[PDB]
Amino acid sequence: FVHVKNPYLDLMDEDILYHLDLGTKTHNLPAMFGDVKFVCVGGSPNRMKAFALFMHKELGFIKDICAGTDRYCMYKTGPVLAISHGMGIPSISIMLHELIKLLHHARCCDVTIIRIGTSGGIGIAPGTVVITDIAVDSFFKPRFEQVILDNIVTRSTELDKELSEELFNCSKEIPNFPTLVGHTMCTYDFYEGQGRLDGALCSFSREKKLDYLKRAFKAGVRNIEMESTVFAAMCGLCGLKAAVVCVTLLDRLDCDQINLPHDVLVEYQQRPQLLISNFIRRRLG
Amino acid sequence: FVHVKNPYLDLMDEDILYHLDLGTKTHNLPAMFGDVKFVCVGGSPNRMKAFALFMHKELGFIKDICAGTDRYCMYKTGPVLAISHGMGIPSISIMLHELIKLLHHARCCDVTIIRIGTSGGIGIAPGTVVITDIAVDSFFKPRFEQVILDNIVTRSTELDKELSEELFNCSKEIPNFPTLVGHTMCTYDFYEGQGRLDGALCSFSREKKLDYLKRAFKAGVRNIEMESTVFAAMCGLCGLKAAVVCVTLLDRLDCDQINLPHDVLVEYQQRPQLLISNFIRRRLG
Ligand SMILES: O=c1[nH]c(=O)n(COCCO)cc1Cc1ccccc1
């Protein structure tokens, strides 16, 4: 069963999920979500809707459950729940708080949660799929520094090991699907935080930025995105078995911009869902 | 003229605003945006669209300019540009990198940018509008900690002094419109970062949370939201004249929950736009 790490929550008469337009009094959560086994999360609402429709076809069998809010979108096809999370640590963390609670109230059990996304690559070919083993912060440390009241509390960021191995095993059967298990760096800023030179702000040199990206590579970093540390930390704290599966759209050692025919970009963006469908069909098999 | 603070930017052949679905070569930015004088930013696309429709009627004269992406929404009516920014520091920072560049490329001049939002109040009545003077972090310090590569750089978080005074002076004429100029705390987490007891995670007691909020009040904090430090720091660095105007929906020293008739909620939500309309018509009057 999905647990929370909050001694007060179940002492409450009612729980309202403020950003999902759901609640324990207004909705029958167990009835609505009791059968969920696979939770897939990603930044882009359109991606996540397209993912749900894709899974619907793949499983051989769909409306936004959060149609009443504009914060996040949520789609359900069978035991698969797909949810958008917007961009950045705070945005995914709001969603995770409310989703983990939803799973808890619905009394879901034997659940797997997977983030699917895009990322920038370091020293790997554009379009390589990275299955994160450990998410690291901007200083390449395997940790999430959580601010709780006015206090920094450090949390571990390891994804589920057996799960990452299982996804990697699934990837091997897929043709023209470059895949690796490796560290993912998660940043608070897309621009200076990732050593881009095209922000409204850039206070460092080309030399510093290329030195940073190489030191990241030496430290084990293979891709870079904006949600993996909080995602891994929150799931771990609550005992949820979690994975991150991101496709890289470019190699940052060689390139700041995506230079791809639209058609190749679309294929790449679809790579994580391809792997996740394989995984899910294997589990249900 | 709106400036950037990046010596690499205008040595570039083209500049693609990836999350806005706009670029210098695919779009004529001066033609589209050159007349923009007032930039209004908020978390919710629904709210920002309704604000664009409100201002259109208020100025006595609208589609999503960013229809091609799902990351942000953007509406224009005359000299007024309304943009959504999702939730949290990273989400607004990406919008702001790309927004400020756009204003630069468009050769916009005499621009005022204003964040409008909702917030939790501390020790002030629900429905109170706070015009932020200085944005502070979770420890109550007047600084934004920027992570740039693997270094931390501290930045000032003062909003424009004259603009805040001018916004306050505008509020005086408005009946039943409680307003104050004061500190706004910006957190990276909605739940544990704001002393909530109803997260998936809760690592503190009720007693500790109350003490935290009382020390926040002692330190000058009047309201709590999630975007103000990075908004203040980035606008300041680029020499942009910026304000934050948020309505409080509850007094966190009293209750953890919003308890309001639907009609009252709607009125409180619309209070920041009411003040911004007054301000904009004054400037154009
Ligand atoms: O370099 C990246 N960094 C990154 O954090 N992501 C993840 O998504 C952040 C929002 O697009 C995605 C990428 C690939 C990319 C590169 C340039 C433009 C757009 C996307």
Ligand SMILES: O=c1[nH]c(=O)n(COCCO)cc1Cc1ccccc1
């Ligand atoms: O307490 C708050 N804290 C806060 O950071 N905000 C700002 O936006 C967060 C997204 O809802 C808004 C509020 C008001 C609130 C209170 C309870 C539920 C929802 C919103």
